[PDB]
Amino acid sequence: ASISGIFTTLGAAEAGDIVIRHWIDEKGIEIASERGVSAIITQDLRGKSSRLAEEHGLPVILVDRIENANALALSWTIERFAPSSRRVVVTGTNGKSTTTHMIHHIIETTGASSYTNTDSRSEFNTLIDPVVSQQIAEASSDGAPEFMVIEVSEVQGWLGRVMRDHARMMTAAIGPEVVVITNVAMDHIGLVESVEDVFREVAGALRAIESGVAVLNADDERVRAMAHVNPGLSVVFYGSDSPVRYDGEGIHIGGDLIIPAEELPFRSEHFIQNTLAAAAACLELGFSPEDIRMGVKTYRPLKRRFSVLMTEPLVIDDFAHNPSGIRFTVRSAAANLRGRLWVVNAIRGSRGEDINVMNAAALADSLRGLNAELIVTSSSDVVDEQNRVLENERRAFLGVLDERGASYIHVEKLRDALRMVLDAAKPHDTILLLGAQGMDPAAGIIDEIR
């Protein structure tokens, strides 16, 4: 067998490797020939790199769309390195990383081998980079893994130009036996404008395979509607009334109650819903409810997923960046509320006015009827230029809170906002920190303040 001549990114390339890259320039061609790459697959040769590659004797394949090249690179890598592995694809709007990470964990707890592309900062779930197929080759080097758990981004776009049927394309390249759908929610405005745009893209992952099991969410009206998308698939449900379900007693696998409420390591809506999805898929992979019970109790969450940073006052760090996420996180925070709720939310810099208006609206609704104070931050002191809050975005966000009459204060710096909330709060109060990149460095600042 051979473990060389594999598809890699330019940075990870070695002699004989095939670099796949959205675009390449004259400097890229130089680095490539220095490393001895066999060939380069790109969508764009910049300037005079086409003639420089000819001089270096480096073959270059120009493709109409790099996502198609990466999808083919992915199928060939799987057939070449792990064709017998059982694969699971996880897609939806929210909770893909948690569901995928929990399935990977339940399988690894069992003693079985598994590959996963997930991490807290899940950036390698796209067909713009050959990173997943590069990682699959690296994992299969000293033997192929029995299982693969792969998170597939429902919506993707390069140059803001949407890659139609990206989920279908990526799923078909993997060819999983199980496909897990989490939810259909609004996010990535520009790529999608309507909830039907999201529904069509998420449902495409089911059209990607002729046969297998579809693990669908009974608590989402749109995800439940996906049962009649691919009749060749056997459908399994999770959530309410379904075999895998949650209530006061706890998590019920089948007629029995496998995990009682107190045994649960975490209790948030996000954790619980994503755990039922992971459990449902694991039953289809032929795992016992005891293997699942053991996995769940041994589980360690991803960074900023309802992460408890402090006790008295309770400080929770959640990465809610969209409306349904924000609504869910606030409900989970309000559940064990003993005093005032202090919400520090970071405006999504350089993400357009539409997401910021939708989030501002969701924040206002979730907070009405609560003993709560809202501190909105620009985090200008801790963000890079790719996440800078623009004037029009700040005014759009604060406009919604003004129109609605939500009690708020805008604080430009994240460090000023975190100092402000820690002084104002009392031990029985709960501080909920929300956001994406703008709220990422809050855990680190809290350490410097305490």
DSSP codes, 191-244: TB-SHHHHHHHHHHHHHT-SSEEEEEETTSHHHHGGGGT-TTEEEEEEESSSSE
Residues forming beta bridges with residue 20, ordered by sequence position:
41
DSSP codes, 329-384: HHHHHHHT--S-EEEEEE--TTS-HHHHHHHHHHHHHHHTTSSEEEEEE--TTT--
Q: What one-letter code names the amino acid at 148?
A: M
d(CA 40, CA 32): 8
Sign of the four-CA dihedral 68, 71, 76, 79: negative
Is the separation of the CB atoms in 321 and 94 below 8 Å?
A: no
Q: Which residues of 124-155 are buried (b: 16+ CB within 10 A; e: fewer)?
A: bbbbbbbbbbbbbbebbeeebbbbbbbbbbbb
User: Counting beta carbons within 10 angstroms of the beta carbon of residue 398, is it exposed (0 to 12), middle (13 to 18) or buried (19 or more)?
Assistant: middle
Q: Taking Cα atoms as reference points, which of 153, 154, 150, 158 lies closest to residue 128?
A: 158
Q: Kindly state the tokens that stand for 239.
A: 């959530």
C-alpha distances in Å from residue 425, one per residue of 315, 326, 344, 372, 448: 10, 21, 12, 11, 18
Resolution of the entry in angstroms: 2.9
Q: Give residue limits of the domains in the chain.
A: 68-298, 307-449
For 21, the 3-state DSSP assignment is strand
CATH topology of domain 307-449: Protein-Tyrosine Phosphatase; Chain A (3.90.190)
Q: Kindly state the tokens that stand for 238.
A: 């999770």
Count of CB atoms within 10 A of residue 79's CB? 10
d(CA 136, CA 70): 13
- DSSP secondary-structure letter at 249? S
Count of CB atoms within 10 A of residue 105's CB? 19
Count of CB atoms within 10 A of residue 238's CB? 28
C-alpha distances in Å from residue 257, one per residue of 107, 215, 265, 271, 272: 21, 20, 16, 18, 14
Is the separation of the CB atoms in 30 and 38 below 8 Å?
A: no
Peptide bond into 301 cis (omega under 30): no
Is the separation of the CB atoms in 373 and 342 below 8 Å?
A: yes
Experimental method: X-ray
Q: Taking Cα atoms as reference points, which of 233, 210, 205, 237 lies closest to residue 224?
A: 237
Which region holds residue 5: left if phi is over 0, alpha if psi is between -120 and 50, else beta? left
Task: Determine how β-strand 60-62 pairs with β-strand 212-217.
Answer: unpaired
| Element of type H or E holding 180 | strand 178-181
Name the CATH superfamily housing domain 68-298: Mur-like, catalytic domain (3.40.1190.10)
| Element of type H or E holding 114 | strand 114-116
Residue that has been written with the tokens 């997943």 in this structure: 132
d(CA 43, CA 148): 29
d(CA 280, CA 261): 18
d(CA 226, CA 201): 11
Is the separation of the CB atoms in 117 and 151 below 8 Å?
A: yes
Q: How many helices (H) and strands (E) does the chain have?
A: 15, 21
Q: Kindly state the tokens that stand for 224.
A: 């439940």
User: CA torsion, points 287, 290, 294, 295, in degrees to nearest 10?
Assistant: 20
* Chain centroid to CA 444: 22
Q: Kindly state the tokens that stand for 397.
A: 């966000």
